[PDB]
Swiss-Prot record:
Gene giving rise to this polypeptide: IL2
Linked pathology: A chromosomal aberration involving IL2 is found in a form of T-cell acute lymphoblastic leukemia (T-ALL). Translocation t(4;16)(q26;p13) with involves TNFRSF17.
Family per similarity comment: Belongs to the IL-2 family.
Domain of life, source organism: Eukaryota
Keywords carried by this UniProt record: Adaptive immunity, Chromosomal rearrangement, Cytokine, Disulfide bond, Glycoprotein, Growth factor, Immunity, Pharmaceutical, Proto-oncogene, Secreted, Signal
Cystine bridges: 53-94
Protein's UniProt name: Interleukin-2
Transmembrane residue ranges: none
GO terms for MF: carbohydrate binding; cytokine activity; glycosphingolipid binding; growth factor activity; interleukin-2 receptor binding; kappa-type opioid receptor binding; kinase activator activity
């Protein structure tokens, strides 16, 4: 059971890295515009339940990705896969930090979240 959970988190981790890697490959003028969009961050993220904070930001994430545009998956598909994993993992009202972050900082934070939880299940 713990193994199934770890594997789901690992897939979420790779999914998030794929978005970040794709975004890092945008041309700079484009990336500069993309970095103006505000994302909301969890005050605290240490347990699966905290994934609610990620779930609520999936819509704006998909919108921004759609607005952007070589991605080997359509944003709707990529976000759908992330959506499924998040829904199955968190099975609480998300507390957000005052400061917003760019899409890059937001992805990093959630990538870090996954890596941290994965390491408690090894």
């Amino acid at each position: 059971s713990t193994k199934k959970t770890q594997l789901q988190l690992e897939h979420l981790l790779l999914d998030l890295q794929m978005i970040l890697n794709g975004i890092n490959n945008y041309k700079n003028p484009k990336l500069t515009r993309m970095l103006t969009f505000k994302f909301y961050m969890p005050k605290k993220a240490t347990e699966l339940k905290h994934l609610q904070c990620l779930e609520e930001e999936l819509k704006p994430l998909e919108e921004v990705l759609n607005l952007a545009q070589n991605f080997h998956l359509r944003p709707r598909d990529l976000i759908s896969n992330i959506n499924v994993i998040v829904l199955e993992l968190k099975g609480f009202m998300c507390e957000y930090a005052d400061e917003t972050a760019t899409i890059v900082e937001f992805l990093n934070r959630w990538i870090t979240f996954c890596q941290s939880i994965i390491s408690t299940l090894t």
